[PDB]
PDB file of C-alpha atoms and ligand atoms in Angstrom:
ATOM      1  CA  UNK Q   1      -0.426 -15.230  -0.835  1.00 34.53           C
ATOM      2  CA  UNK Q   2       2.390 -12.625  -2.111  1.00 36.99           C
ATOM      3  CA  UNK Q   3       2.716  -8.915  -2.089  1.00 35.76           C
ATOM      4  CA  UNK Q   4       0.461  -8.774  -5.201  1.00 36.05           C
ATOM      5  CA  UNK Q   5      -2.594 -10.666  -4.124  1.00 36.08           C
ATOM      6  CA  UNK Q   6      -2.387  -8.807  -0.540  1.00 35.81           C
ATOM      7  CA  UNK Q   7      -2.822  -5.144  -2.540  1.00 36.06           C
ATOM      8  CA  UNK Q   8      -5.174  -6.802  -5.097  1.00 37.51           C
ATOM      9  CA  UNK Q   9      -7.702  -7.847  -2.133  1.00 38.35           C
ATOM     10  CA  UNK Q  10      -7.174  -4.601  -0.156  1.00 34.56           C
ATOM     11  CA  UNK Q  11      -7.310  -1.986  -3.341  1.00 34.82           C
ATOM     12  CA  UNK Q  12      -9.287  -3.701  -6.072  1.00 33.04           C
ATOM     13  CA  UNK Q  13      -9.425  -3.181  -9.617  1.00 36.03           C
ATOM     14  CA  UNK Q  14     -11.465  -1.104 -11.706  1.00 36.75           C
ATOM     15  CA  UNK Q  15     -10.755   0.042 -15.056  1.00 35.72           C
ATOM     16  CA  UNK Q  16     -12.138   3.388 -15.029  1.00 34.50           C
ATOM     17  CA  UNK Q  17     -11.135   6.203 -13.038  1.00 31.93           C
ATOM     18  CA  UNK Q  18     -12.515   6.138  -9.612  1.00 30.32           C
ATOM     19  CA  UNK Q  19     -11.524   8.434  -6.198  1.00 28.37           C
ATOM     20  CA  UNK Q  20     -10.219   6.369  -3.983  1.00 25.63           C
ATOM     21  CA  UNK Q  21     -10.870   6.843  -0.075  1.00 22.87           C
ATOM     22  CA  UNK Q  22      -9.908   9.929   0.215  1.00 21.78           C
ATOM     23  CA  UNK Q  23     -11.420  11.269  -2.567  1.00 21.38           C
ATOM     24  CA  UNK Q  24      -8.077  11.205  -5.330  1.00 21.17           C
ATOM     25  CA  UNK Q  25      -8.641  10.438  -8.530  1.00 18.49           C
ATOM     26  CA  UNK Q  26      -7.170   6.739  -9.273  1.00 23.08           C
ATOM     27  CA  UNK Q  27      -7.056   3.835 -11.410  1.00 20.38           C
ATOM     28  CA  UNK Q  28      -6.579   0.126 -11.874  1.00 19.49           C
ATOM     29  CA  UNK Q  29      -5.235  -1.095  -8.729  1.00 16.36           C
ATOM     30  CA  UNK Q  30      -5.114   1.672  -6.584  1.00 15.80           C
ATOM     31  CA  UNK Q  31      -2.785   3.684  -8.456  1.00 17.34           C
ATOM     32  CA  UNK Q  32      -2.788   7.162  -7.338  1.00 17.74           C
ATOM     33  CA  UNK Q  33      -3.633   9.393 -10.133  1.00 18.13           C
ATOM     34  CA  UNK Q  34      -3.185  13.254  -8.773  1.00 19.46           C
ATOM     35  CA  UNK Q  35      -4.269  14.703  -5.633  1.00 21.59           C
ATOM     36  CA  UNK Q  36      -5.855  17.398  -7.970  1.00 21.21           C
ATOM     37  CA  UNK Q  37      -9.834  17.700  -7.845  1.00 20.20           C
ATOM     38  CA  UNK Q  38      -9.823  18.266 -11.297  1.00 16.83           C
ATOM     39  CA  UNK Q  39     -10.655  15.187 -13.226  1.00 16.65           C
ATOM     40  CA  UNK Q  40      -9.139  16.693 -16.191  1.00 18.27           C
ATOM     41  CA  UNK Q  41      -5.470  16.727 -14.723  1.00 18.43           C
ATOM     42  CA  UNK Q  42      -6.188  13.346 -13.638  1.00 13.78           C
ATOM     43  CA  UNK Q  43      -7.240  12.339 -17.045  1.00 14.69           C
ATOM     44  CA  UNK Q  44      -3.713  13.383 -18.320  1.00 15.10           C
ATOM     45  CA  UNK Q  45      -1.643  11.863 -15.600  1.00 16.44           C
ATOM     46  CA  UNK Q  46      -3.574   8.528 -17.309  1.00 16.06           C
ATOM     47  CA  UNK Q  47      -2.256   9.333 -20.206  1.00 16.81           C
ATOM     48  CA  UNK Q  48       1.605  10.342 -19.288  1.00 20.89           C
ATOM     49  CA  UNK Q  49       1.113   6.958 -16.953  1.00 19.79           C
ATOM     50  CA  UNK Q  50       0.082   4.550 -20.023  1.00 15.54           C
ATOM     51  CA  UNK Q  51       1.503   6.215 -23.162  1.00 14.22           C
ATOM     52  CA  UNK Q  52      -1.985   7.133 -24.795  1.00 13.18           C
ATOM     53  CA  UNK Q  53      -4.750   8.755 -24.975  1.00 14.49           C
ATOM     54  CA  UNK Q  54      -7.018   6.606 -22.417  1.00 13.01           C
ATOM     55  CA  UNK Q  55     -10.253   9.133 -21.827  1.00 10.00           C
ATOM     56  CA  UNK Q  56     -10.086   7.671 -18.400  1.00  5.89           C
ATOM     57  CA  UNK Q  57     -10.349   4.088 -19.524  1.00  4.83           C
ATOM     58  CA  UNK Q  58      -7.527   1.432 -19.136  1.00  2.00           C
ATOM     59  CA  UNK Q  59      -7.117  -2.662 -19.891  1.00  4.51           C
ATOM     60  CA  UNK Q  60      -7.035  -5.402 -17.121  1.00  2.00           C
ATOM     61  CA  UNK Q  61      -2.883  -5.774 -18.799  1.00  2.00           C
ATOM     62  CA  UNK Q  62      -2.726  -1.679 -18.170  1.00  2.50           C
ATOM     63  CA  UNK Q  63      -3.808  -1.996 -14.675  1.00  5.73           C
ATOM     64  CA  UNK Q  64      -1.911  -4.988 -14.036  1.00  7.84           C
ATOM     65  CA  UNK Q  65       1.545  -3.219 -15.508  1.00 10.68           C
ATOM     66  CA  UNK Q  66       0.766   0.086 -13.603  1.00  8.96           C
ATOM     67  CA  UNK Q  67       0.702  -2.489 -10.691  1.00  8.64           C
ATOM     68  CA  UNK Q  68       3.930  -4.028 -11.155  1.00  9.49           C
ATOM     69  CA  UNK Q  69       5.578  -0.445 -11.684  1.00  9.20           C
ATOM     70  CA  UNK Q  70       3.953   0.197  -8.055  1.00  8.58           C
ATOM     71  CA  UNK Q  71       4.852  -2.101  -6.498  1.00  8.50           C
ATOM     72  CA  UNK Q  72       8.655  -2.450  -7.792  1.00  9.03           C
ATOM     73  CA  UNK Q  73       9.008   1.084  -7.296  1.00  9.23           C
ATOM     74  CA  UNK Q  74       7.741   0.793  -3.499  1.00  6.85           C
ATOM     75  CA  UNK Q  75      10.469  -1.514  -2.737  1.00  3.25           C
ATOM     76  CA  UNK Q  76      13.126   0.041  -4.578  1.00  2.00           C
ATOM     77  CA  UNK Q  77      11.992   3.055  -2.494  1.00  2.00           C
ATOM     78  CA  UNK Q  78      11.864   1.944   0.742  1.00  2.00           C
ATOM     79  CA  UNK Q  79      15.815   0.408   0.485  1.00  2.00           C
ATOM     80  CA  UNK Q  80      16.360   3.483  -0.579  1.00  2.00           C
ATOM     81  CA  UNK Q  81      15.012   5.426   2.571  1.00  2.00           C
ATOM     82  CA  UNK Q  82      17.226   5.872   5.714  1.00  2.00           C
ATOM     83  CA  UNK Q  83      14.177   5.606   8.062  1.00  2.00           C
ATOM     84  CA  UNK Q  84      12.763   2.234   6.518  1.00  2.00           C
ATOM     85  CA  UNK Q  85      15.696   0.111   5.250  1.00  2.00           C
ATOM     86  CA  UNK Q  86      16.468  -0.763   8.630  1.00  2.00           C
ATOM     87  CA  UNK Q  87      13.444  -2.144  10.170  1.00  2.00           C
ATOM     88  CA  UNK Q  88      12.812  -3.808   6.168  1.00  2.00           C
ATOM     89  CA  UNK Q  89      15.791  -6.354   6.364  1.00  2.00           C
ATOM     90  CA  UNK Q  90      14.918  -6.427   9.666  1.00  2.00           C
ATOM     91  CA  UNK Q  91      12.268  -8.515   8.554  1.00  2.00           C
ATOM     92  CA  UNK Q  92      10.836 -11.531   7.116  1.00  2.00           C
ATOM     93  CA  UNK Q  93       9.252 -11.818   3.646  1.00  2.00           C
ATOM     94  CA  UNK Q  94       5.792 -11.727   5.132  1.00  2.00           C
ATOM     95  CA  UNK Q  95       6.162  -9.039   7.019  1.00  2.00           C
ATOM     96  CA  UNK Q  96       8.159  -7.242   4.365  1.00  2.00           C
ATOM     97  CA  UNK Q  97       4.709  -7.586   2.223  1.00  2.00           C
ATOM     98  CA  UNK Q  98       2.640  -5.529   5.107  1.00  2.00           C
ATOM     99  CA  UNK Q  99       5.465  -3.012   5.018  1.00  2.00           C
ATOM    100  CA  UNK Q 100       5.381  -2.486   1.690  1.00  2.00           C
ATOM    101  CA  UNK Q 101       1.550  -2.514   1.900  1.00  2.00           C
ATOM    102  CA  UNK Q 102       1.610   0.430   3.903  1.00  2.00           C
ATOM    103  CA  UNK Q 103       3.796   2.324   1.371  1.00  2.00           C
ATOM    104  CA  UNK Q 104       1.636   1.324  -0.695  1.00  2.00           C
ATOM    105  CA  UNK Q 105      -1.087   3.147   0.491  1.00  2.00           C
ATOM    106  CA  UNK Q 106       0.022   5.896   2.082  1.00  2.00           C
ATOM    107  CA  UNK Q 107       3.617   6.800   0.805  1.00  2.00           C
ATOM    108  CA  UNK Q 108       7.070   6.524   1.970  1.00  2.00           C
ATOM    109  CA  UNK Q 109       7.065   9.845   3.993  1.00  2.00           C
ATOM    110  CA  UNK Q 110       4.096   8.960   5.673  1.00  2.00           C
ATOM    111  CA  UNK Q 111       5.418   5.646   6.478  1.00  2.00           C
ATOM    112  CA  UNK Q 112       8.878   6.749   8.206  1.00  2.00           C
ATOM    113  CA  UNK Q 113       6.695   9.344  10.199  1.00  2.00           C
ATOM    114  CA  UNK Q 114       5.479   5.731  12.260  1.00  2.00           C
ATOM    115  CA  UNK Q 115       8.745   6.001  14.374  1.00  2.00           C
ATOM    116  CA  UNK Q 116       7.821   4.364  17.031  1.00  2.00           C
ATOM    117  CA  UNK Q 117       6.022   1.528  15.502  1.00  2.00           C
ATOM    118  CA  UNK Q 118       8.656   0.614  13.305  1.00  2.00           C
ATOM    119  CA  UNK Q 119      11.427   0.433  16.375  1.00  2.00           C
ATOM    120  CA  UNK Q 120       9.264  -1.699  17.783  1.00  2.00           C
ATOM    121  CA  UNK Q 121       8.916  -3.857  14.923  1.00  2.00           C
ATOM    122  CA  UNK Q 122      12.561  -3.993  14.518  1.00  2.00           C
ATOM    123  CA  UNK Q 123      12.518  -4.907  18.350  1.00  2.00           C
ATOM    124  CA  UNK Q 124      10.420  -8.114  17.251  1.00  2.00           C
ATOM    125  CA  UNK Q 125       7.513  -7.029  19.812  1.00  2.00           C
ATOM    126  CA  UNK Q 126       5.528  -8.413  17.655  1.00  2.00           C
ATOM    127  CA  UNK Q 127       2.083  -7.352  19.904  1.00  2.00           C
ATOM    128  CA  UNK Q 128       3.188  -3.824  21.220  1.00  2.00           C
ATOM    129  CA  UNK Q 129       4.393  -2.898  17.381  1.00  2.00           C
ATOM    130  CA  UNK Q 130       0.623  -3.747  16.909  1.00  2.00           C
ATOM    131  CA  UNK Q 131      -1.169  -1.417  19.477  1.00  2.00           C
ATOM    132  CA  UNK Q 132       1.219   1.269  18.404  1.00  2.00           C
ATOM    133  CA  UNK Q 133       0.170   0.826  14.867  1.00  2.00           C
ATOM    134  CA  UNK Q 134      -3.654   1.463  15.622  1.00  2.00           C
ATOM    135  CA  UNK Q 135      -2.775   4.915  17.169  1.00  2.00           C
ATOM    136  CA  UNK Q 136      -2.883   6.300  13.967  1.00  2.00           C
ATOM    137  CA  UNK Q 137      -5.182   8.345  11.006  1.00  2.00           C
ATOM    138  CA  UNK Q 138      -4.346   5.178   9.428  1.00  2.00           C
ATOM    139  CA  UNK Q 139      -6.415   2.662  11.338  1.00  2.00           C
ATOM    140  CA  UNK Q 140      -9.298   5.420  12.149  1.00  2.00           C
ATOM    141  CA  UNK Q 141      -9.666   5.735   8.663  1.00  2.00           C
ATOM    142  CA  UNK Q 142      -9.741   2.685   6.967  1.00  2.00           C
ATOM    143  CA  UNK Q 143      -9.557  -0.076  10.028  1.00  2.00           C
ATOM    144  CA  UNK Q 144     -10.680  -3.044   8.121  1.00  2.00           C
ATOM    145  CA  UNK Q 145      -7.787  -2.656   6.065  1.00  2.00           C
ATOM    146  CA  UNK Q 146      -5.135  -1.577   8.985  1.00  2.00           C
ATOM    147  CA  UNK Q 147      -6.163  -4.126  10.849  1.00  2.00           C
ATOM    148  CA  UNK Q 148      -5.352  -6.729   8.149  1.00  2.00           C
ATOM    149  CA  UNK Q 149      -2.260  -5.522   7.613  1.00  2.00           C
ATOM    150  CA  UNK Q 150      -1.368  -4.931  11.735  1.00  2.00           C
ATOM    151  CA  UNK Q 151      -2.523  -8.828  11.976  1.00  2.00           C
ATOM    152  CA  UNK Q 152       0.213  -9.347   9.974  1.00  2.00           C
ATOM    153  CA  UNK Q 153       3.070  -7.597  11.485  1.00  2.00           C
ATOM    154  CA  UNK Q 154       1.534  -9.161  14.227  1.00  2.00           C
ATOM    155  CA  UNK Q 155       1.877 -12.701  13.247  1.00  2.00           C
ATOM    156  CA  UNK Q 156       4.026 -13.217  10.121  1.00  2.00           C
ATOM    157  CA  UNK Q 157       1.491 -14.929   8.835  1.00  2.00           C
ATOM    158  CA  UNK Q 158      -1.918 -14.761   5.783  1.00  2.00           C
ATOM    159  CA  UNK Q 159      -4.639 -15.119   8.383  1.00  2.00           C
ATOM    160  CA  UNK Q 160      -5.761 -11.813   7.507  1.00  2.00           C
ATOM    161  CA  UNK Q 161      -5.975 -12.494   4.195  1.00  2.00           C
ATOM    162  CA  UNK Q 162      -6.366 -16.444   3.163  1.00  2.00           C
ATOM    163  CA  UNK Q 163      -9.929 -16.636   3.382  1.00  2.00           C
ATOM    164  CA  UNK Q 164     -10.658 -13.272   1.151  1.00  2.00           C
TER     165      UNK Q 164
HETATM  166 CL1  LIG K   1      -5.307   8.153  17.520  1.00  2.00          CL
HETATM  167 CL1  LIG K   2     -10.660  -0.308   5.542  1.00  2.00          CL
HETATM  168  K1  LIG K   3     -11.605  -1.389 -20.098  1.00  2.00           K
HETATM  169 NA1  LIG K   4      -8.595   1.390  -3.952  1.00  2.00          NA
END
């Protein structure tokens, strides 16, 4: 397991634009096209995002680089951010992966408004970090994957995830 497979299990991949859970136009592996409900504006975000005309169609490679540019881009962000870099190097490299898992998904701001979780995560209370985390929109919304990711934060380790 690695930062890619974890955000392959827990977004997929599909090739044609899809709305995601809450209902934004996406692609590939859960790349965020536009909040916008029109699925013309999403339809040229595609395009600006892969340098062609697409008609909301893209490759397995054109997911799989969109990916990579997430993902890279996640990271870079979160050393970048006051509120995160901290409890990040903070961490180990497993539990980096669920931190960048949750940017991820639901954006950097959104992220650093988890206060409180992420002192206690750079605490190391490993279990209260976790009950904290569930007190969210997050894990009401989509708990299957919030609890994968608490688990863990929890642990440090795949168990979550080796077996999917
Ligand atoms: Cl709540
Ligand atoms: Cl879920
Ligand atoms: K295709
Ligand atoms: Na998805």
């Amino acid at each position: 397991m690695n930062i890619f497979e974890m955000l392959r299990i827990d977004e997929g991949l599909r090739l044609k634009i899809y709305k995601d859970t809450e209902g934004y136009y996406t692609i590939g592996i859960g790349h965020l096209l536009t909040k916008s409900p029109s699925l013309n504006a999403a339809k040229s975000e595609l395009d600006k995002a892969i340098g062609r005309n697409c008609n909301g169609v893209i490759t397995k490679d054109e997911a799989e680089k969109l990916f990579n540019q997430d993902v890279d881009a996640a990271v870079r962000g979160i050393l970048r951010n006051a509120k995160l870099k901290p409890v990040y190097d903070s961490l180990d490299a497993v539990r980096h992966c669920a931190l960048i898992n949750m940017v991820f998904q639901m954006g950097e701001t959104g992220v650093a408004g988890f206060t409180n979780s992420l002192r206690m995560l750079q605490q190391k209370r490993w279990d209260e970090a976790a009950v904290n985390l569930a007190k969210s929109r997050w894990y009401n919304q989509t708990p299957n994957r919030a609890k994968r990711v608490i688990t863990t934060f929890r642990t440090g380790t795949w168990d979550a995830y080796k077996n999917l």
